[PDB]
Nucleic acid binder design. Structure first.
Lengths: 80, 85, 121, 159, 194, 131
RNA sequence: UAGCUAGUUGGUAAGGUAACGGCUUACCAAGGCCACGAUGGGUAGGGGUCCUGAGAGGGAGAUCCCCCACACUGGUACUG
RNA sequence: GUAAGAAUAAGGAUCGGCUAACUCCGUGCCAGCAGCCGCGGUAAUACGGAGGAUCCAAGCGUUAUCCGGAAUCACUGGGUUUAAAGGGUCCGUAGGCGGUUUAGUAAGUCAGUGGUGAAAGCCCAUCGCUCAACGGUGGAACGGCCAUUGAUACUGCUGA
């Protein structure tokens, strides 16, 4: 295989059918002042039985595009 | 069809060719795949720097040499070596 | 100041407003004159400087200063403005090339011949 | 030293207003150095230029200072302010040259430096920039001096 | 281009005979001009000093400012003493070596003999005066113009010159402590870094 | 506080400026490591780790010459700050005082000097520099 | 320039395309983005690179090479 | 390669200070010059001409657009009593920073390996055009990104 990309994030909202949206925070150094800045990005993952709720810590992996703006799936729910 | 051809890179009056494998649908001295050898027809011996470790590899992969390419690869080897099955 | 303040809003760099603006950022511009007259400096100089109202090819009305002595510069003449203001006439911010299409050069000039458009005697 | 050469940095004409008219006067700054180890600056005030320069060099002949100039130039980088000016001296090589300003060049040529880079990111007053260069040059201590002050051999300060 | 003018004037405006210590160096040694013969300006600026110290070397060899700056920034690529390598590459010129070998007693004659296919360098004839002689070159004289009238008429520590075959075997690149010249390279470096 | 390391350096700098003899700084592992490094490099005379406190004290004796005192600590400043952390591998270490000063670098092995870490080819975070 | 989006956001079945996919259709829910700058306006092809500068940076994207868009102004399909 | 013949070939800018180079003649706040200071009202080293001098050189000056000098937007590398600059004062949201010790992970940080970072271009070294420009070869660089293996001193997270 090839071990497609994987991210770890926090569930932000569950208001859709069989789909969740999580937010991932990363600390990147500023290109000029060299100060580490917390930048956020929101992914859209795929859920089957609607198990995770807002405030959890999930781990998603990149797959084929299952829909528009939806190319991830939750596999490794860690904390609730 | 990937072909083994020559790319002109010298100066005005004195040419200097690179024996390189490239796609036929590309410009002469532009994009290529992998530089193979080097040809300098500025001295009497007509110096060459062929690389028989990749020439036969490209020939097996499906390269198609031209007249000058197959005349440079003639008196430097890799043709009597590509023939051996 | 603070690194956090700089990260939020960095240093603002100004644009350095140019000097010669009404010539479209070209070295020379052709133009036609409409009024050739004379003006006074501010102080304490006392003279009669020769200026001309030139309408450039890009639709700009400027005031050019005629260098040297000796010229025709009628009410309608094709001149070539190059730029370079003077600190005596308020408003004149351009110069006219001597030796251009229609403007005359100078006679009896021998030292600064490259300027004022004078041939070598 | 004994073979002291002088150099006039700047001569400025001053004026004092009185009831009658203007009372002129000349002030001169002269840096005199042995070109090897010692240098000193002085100020002279008079009415004639030659008398002012003579008083300046006679006052600068006193209070000479010794400066370490390891090899051919300064041992390390140093800053000197003395109020208005702000001079920064950095050693370069053994063949670079003295890249200095207007008044710093005379001081660096009179003290005996031949390859250094000095940036004056401050005022342009000859009265203050010479003293700023002096303040930046007197704070320099060589490797032997720092080793003796620490108490460690002269190999741990390098390794 | 070349100077092609009076050399005594150039010697007088610098106070040092660089084209041969001979006639006219004395006898009004003061600089030329109607205002140079009189009491010149006393206060001489450091910029004037550096500029004249550069022009002395720029006039002694016959180099223009363009080529001099090119050679300076070429020699400045060496990590050693910049002025030292500058003077070394300026001395390594072909016409300068021909002048030092005894032939063409002046550099102005060196850059008129070398530019006439009268001298050969390592076999093939080289008629370029700015030719940079690397250490270990063999300079000879063309056999056609070998028995000339001026060559035998006109005929160092690093040049091994042999008069029997017009040899000279340029080797052992000299140093500042060996090249005799009354010029200060540190001033030239400071002027070009100004 | 905002930077105990900055306070530890500031107390020493102020005492040196005021021509004191001993300082009674609070204690911590990082301050003890910095004190050990400084004593090994030869910028302080002696140091004592005083107990009988909830945190503990560090009593450091400052060094001056026996004539023309001229304190050996002329400039002791920080490079990394809690508002801007500056790290560097074993190629971008500073050149404090042209090799005549020390630069403390917290490395993956421990607390070392800028010159003692370049030999080990380890990077780390530059904490402070002393002339 | 503080609200924007209504096939828009997600799902269930079909039609499909070389190929997954609101790409399209039928049905259900109201979702999705936004101060870490949506939306709106002005300008602009992008990069390897060029100039300058001690460096950090700043200013441009000719000629050489790679990618994209276009062929009087617009739309559509066939052959392959 | 052979044969007459120095024959077939030097100009532009500047000269009060910045900035390298000064004397005279004519005009008398006029004509004019000028990048800034600014010169000319009848003894002008600043205007025009002549002589001399300086720089560059088959080029020399002006204009237009850029970088440096400008530490004059400052992370490197500035300030806020009187020169421009502390909000009229508190509370507090988002955010920024974090007293001591200890256990765990290793996200930031550091080190190694593999892949990539096209060619061309800059730099270094070496060869061919009589040298150079130019061209060939090699190295360095491409400060970056992905995967993996280690260290745990400092920051982040969890527990005490």
């Amino acid at each position: 295989r090839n071990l497609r990309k994987e991210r770890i994030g926090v569930v932000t909202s569950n208001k859709m059918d069989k789909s969740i949206v999580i937010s991932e925070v990363r600390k990147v150094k500023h290109p000029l002042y060299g100060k580490f800045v917390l930048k956020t990005k929101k992914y859209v993952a795929h859920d089957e039985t609607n198990d995770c709720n807002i405030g959890d810590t999930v781990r998603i992996s990149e797959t084929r595009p299952l829909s528009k703006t939806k190319c991830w799936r939750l596999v490794e729910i860690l904390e609730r | 069809s990937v072909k083994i051809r020559l790319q002109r890179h010298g100066k005005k009056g004195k040419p200097f060719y690179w024996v390189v494998a490239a796609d036929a649908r590309s410009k002469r001295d532009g994009k290529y795949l992998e530089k193979i050898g080097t040809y300098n027809p500025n001295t009497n011996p007509a110096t060459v720097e062929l690389n028989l470790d990749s020439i036969v590899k490209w020939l097996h992969q499906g390269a198609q040499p031209t007249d000058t390419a197959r005349a440079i690869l003639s008196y430097k080897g890799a043709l009597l070596k590509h023939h051996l099955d | 100041p603070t690194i956090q303040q700089l990260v939020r809003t960095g240093r603002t760099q100004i644009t350095k407003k140019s000097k010669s603006v009404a010539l479209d950022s070209c070295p020379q511009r052709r133009g036609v004159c409409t009024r050739v007259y004379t003006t006074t400096p501010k102080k304490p100089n006392s003279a009669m400087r020769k200026v001309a109202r030139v309408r450039l090819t890009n639709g700009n009305e400027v005031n050019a200063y005629i260098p040297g002595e000796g010229h025709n510069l009628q009410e309608h003449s094709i001149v070539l403005v190059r730029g370079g203001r003077v600190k005596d006439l308020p408003g004149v911010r351009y110069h006219i090339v001597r030796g251009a299409l229609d403007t005359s050069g100078v006679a009896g000039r021998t030292q600064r011949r490259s300027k004022y458009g004078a041939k070598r005697p | 030293g004994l073979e002291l050469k002088d150099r006039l940095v700047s001569v400025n004409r001053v004026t004092k207003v009185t009831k009658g008219g203007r009372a002129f006067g000349f002030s001169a700054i002269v840096v005199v150095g042995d070109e090897n180890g010692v240098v000193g600056h002085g100020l002279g005030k008079s009415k004639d230029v030659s008398e002012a320069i003579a008083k300046a060099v006679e006052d600068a002949k006193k209070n000479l200072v010794r400066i370490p100039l390891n090899g051919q130039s300064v041992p390390h980088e140093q800053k000197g302010k003395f109020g208005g000016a702000r001079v920064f001296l950095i050693p370069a090589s053994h063949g670079t040259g003295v890249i200095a300003g207007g008044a710093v060049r005379s001081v660096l040529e009179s003290v005996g430096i031949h390859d250094v880079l000095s940036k004056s990111q401050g005022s342009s007053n000859p009265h203050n920039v010479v003293k700023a260069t002096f303040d930046a040059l007197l704070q320099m201590r060589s490797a032997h001096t720092v080793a003796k002050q620490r108490g460690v051999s002269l190999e741990k300060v390098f390794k | 281009a070349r100077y092609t003018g009076p050399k005594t004037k150039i010697a007088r405006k610098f106070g040092e005979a660089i084209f041969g210590d001979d006639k006219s160096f004395e006898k009004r040694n003061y600089p030329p001009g109607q205002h140079g013969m009189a009491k010149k300006r006393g206060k001489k600026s450091e910029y004037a000093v550096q500029l004249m110290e550069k022009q002395k070397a720029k006039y002694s060899y016959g180099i223009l400012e363009k080529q001099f700056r090119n050679l300076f920034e070429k020699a400045s690529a060496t990590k050693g003493v910049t002025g030292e390598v500058l003077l070394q590459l300026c001395e390594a010129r072909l016409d300068n070596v021909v002048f030092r070998m005894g032939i063409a007693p002046s550099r102005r004659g060196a850059r008129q003999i070398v530019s006439h296919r009268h001298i050969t360098v390592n076999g093939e004839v080289v008629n370029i005066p700015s030719y940079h002689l690397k250490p270990g070159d063999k300079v000879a004289v063309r056999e056609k113009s070998k028995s000339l009238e001026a060559i035998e008429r006109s005929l160092y520590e690093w040049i091994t010159w042999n008069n029997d075959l017009k040899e000279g075997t340029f080797v052992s690149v000299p140093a500042r402590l060996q090249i005799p010249e009354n010029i200060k390279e540190q001033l030239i470096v400071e002027l070009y870094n100004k | 506080y905002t930077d105990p390391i900055a306070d530890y350096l500031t107390r020493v700098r102020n005492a040196v400026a005021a021509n004191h003899k001993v300082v009674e700084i609070p204690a911590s592992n990082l301050k003890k490591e910095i004190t050990k490094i400084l004593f090994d490099q030869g910028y302080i005379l002696s140091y004592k780790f005083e107990q009988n406190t909830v945190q503990g004290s560090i009593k450091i004796a400052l060094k001056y010459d026996k004539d023309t005192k001229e304190p050996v600590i002329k400039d002791i400043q920080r490079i990394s700050k809690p508002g801007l952390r500056k790290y560097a591998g074993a190629a971008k270490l500073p050149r404090i005082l042209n090799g005549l000063g020390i630069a403390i670098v917290s490395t993956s092995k421990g607390l070392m000097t800028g010159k003692q870490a370049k030999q080990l080819n380890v990077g780390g975070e530059v904490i402070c520099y002393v002339y």
